[PDB]
């Protein structure tokens, strides 16, 4: 068991929270291009045989209710769980249409002790959002214990679009740099490569192929690196190999 069992009857859910339009009172700008990401993700995970549910323009309360309700489903026949968050953000925070939600509140519903039918199974959170206001200017190139337990934080993978503290960038026509790159690398490589190696290729693609273009010099010629955060305990492949 160097690899997660992915031959349950269902690969699992892929919940996509697509927040485009924000309450006027928040000051947050419409996230042009996010529907392109939401559609790309839906097709990409369809082809990986996930049950995709797209949700659009959820309040902070609706995000928490959705995540609570999804965590209370019986996932026993599912191999894994995927949640994609597309919104404005700050470090540790994703925005509902009407204000901030701590990411930890969301992911806690899926802890090994709180969502028992996902215990031992990979729980993936893919987060396209800023993590702060830093800009990357780039650079030119004895005891066995008896009862076995696992940590309640084990088997999570957080695929952040950007490094801690930094901006994350989006193109109004093409979608976010990270989600564009993630879908392209899953389409190209999910039938062979292990997920960390797919995400490493996503890192390279975002790092090398994108550079911002802005009439505002403050935001021009900027760069981005995504940030893979893994508490996984096994290799993750999006396929299984039949025995006959």
């Amino acid at each position: 068991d160097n690899s997660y069992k992915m031959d349950y009857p269902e690969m699992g859910l892929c919940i996509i929270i697509n927040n485009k339009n924000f309450h006027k009172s928040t000051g947050m700008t419409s996230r042009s291009g996010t529907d392109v990401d939401a559609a790309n993700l839906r097709e990409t995970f369809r082809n990986l045989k996930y049950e995709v549910r797209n949700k659009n323009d959820l309040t902070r309360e609706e995000i928490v209710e959705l995540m609570r309700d999804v965590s209370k489903e019986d996932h026993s026949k599912r191999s894994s769980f995927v949640c994609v968050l597309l919104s404005h953000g700050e470090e540790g925070i994703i925005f509902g249409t009407n204000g901030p939600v701590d990411l930890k509140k969301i992911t806690n519903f899926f802890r090994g002790d709180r969502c028992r039918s996902l215990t031992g199974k990979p729980k993936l959170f893919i987060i396209q959002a800023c993590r702060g206001t830093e800009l990357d200017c780039g650079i030119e190139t004895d005891d066995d214990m008896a009862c076995h337990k696992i940590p309640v934080e084990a088997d999570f993978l957080y695929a952040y679009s950007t490094a801690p503290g930094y901006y994350s960038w989006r193109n109004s026509k093409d979608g976010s740099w990270f989600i564009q790159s993630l879908c392209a690398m899953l389409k190209q490589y999910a039938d062979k490569l292990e997920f960390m190696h797919i995400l490493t290729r996503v890192n390279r693609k975002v790092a090398t192929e994108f550079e911002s273009f802005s009439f505002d010099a403050t935001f021009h010629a900027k760069k981005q690196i995504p940030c893979i955060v893994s508490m996984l305990t096994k290799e993750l492949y999006f396929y299984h190999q039949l025995h006959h």
């Binding site: 700008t29 919104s87 396209q128 989006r170 802005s214």
Partner: peptide
Amino acid sequence: XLQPX
């Protein structure tokens, strides 16, 4: 074209 999240 370019927008921040």
